[PDB]
Amino acid sequence: SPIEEQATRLLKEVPLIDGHNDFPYMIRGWFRNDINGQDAHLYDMPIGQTDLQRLQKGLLGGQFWSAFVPCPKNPDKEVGSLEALRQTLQQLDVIHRLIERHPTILQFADSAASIWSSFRAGRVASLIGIEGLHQIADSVSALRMLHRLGVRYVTLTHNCHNAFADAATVSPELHGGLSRKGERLIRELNRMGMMIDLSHTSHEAQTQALRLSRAPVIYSHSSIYSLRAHARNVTDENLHLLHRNRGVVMICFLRELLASEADQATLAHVIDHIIYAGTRIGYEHVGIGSDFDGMLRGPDGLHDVSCYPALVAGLLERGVSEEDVKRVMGLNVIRVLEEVERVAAELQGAGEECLCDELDEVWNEDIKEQLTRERERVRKL
């Protein structure tokens, strides 16, 4: 078919970069992060919507792999919060090991340049995002270390309120958008060069974040509220504020977010959502954010990671231009990452102060006096 031949050409010319895939959590569920001698299964998985053979088959150019861990359920909130931090390091560890053990397929990327170099070499650009600020255990120091471990976006919440922002699905509201700590964290996220992800956050938290952020943000996996009213989808108000922000809405394949009856959801519905956003806020502010492996079953025609060529072909069939399809595929999210890094370099170049954690005093006045007395003795020498 001419249209399928065109879709294949686009997928080789420009990387399709998906905003969110939970394959690392499936590895934790199935293998418990022990992938030694499991290549036969990693290439052909007995569960889930992602494996390394189907990943090649769908011609995906890049992927933000999710380092998600669940919201803490422990009655002791200090334990649960700290447990989430350790689990985050476990998920970052298995992602890095997955990439390093399969270097012909996957190549780690943390920038626009590293995405392109991976794509030129014929590998899936493998980026990392965490899904919720519960994962950092109220530590901005930990967050900067997660950035150093390769995390390039942070979803502000998952399905739980945290100290920084409100989640969409939980009620009643705690902060009513962002907290004062949340507002201050937006500045730090912009300064360090971390992409803000507004998926899973409340409508009011999106509005506040979209006005406050000095860099473009993303929705890593959210769809359109006007087509399907859901707390997880993006309102027309926030779509416009995303345009002013210069951000990108990466459209989700979650059936609940595409149709009132989940079993009615299709590839056509995903294309409707992409075209709605592209028509109203321009095709330079729309992306693809599957949420593959964050669901049991996908829409008809988008059952797994092998189905991306049907999405590219489907967009071309509806009359979206090649250049606009290339934008939706990956150029837009590359631009956002590039601009986030530019803003960070600008703010770091200007010598902006970093956000520090509130630490306990480890020395009393007796120890501090001993140290100052000792220093003075050394000055006498």
Residue positions in the annotated binding site for Zn(2+)?
A: 20, 22, 131
Give whichever of 84 and 281 is closer to a copy of itself, judged by the CB atom. 84
Residue tagged active-site, from 20, 134, 161, 273 = 20
Tell whether residue 68 is a contact of Mn ion (CB under 5 A): yes
| 41 noted as active-site residue | no
Please give the distance of CA 31 from its chain centroid, rounded to a whole number.
23
What token pair was written down for 45? 């998985």
Complex with Mn ion: residue 125 or 252, whichever CB lies closer: 252
Is residue 303 among the annotated active site residues? Answer: no
The CA–CA distances, whole Å, from 332 to 76, 286, 313, 328, 339 equal: 42, 7, 19, 6, 11
Q: 200 catalytic, yes or no?
A: yes
**Active-site entry in 138, 166, 291, 293:** 291
In angstroms, the CA 164 to CA 157 distance is: 8
Cα–Cα distance measured from residue 13 to residue 15, given in angstroms and rounded to the nearest whole number: 7
- Which residue of 66, 202, 233, 306 would you call a contact of Mn ion, by CB under 5 A? 66
294 touching Mn ion, by CB under 5 A: yes
Report the nearest approach of a copy of itself to the CB of residue 199 (Å). Answer: 22
Distances (CA, A) of 104 to 56, 116, 120, 133, 268: 11, 16, 13, 33, 33
Q: How many CB atoms lie within 10 A of CB 355?
A: 16
Q: Quick one: 3 or 371, whose CB is closer to Cl ion?
A: 371
Where do contacts with a copy of itself occur on this chain (CB under 8 A)?
28-30, 32-34, 36-37, 45-49, 76, 78-79, 82-83, 85-86, 89-90, 92-94, 96-97, 137, 139, 141-142, 144-145, 148-149, 296-297, 303-304, 353-354, 356-357, 359, 361-363, 367-368, 370-372, 374-375, 378, 381
| Residue 230 among the catalytic residues | no
Q: Of these partners, Mn ion, Cl ion, a copy of itself, none, which one is at the site of residue 370 (CB under 5 to 8 Å by kind)?
A: a copy of itself
Nearer to a copy of itself, 246 or 303 (CB): 303
Enumerate residues 6+ apart whose C-beta is below 8 A from 115: 15, 17, 62, 109, 125, 127, 330, 334, 337
Residue of 153, 145, 296 whose CA lies nearest to 215: 153
Q: Return the bridge partners of 128, or none.
A: 65, 151
What residues are designated binding site for substrate?
158, 232, 291
Specify the amino acid at residue 286.
V
Residues engaged in binding Mn ion (CB under 5 A):
22, 66, 68, 131, 294
- As annotated, the active-site residues are 20, 22, 131, 158, 200, 221, 291
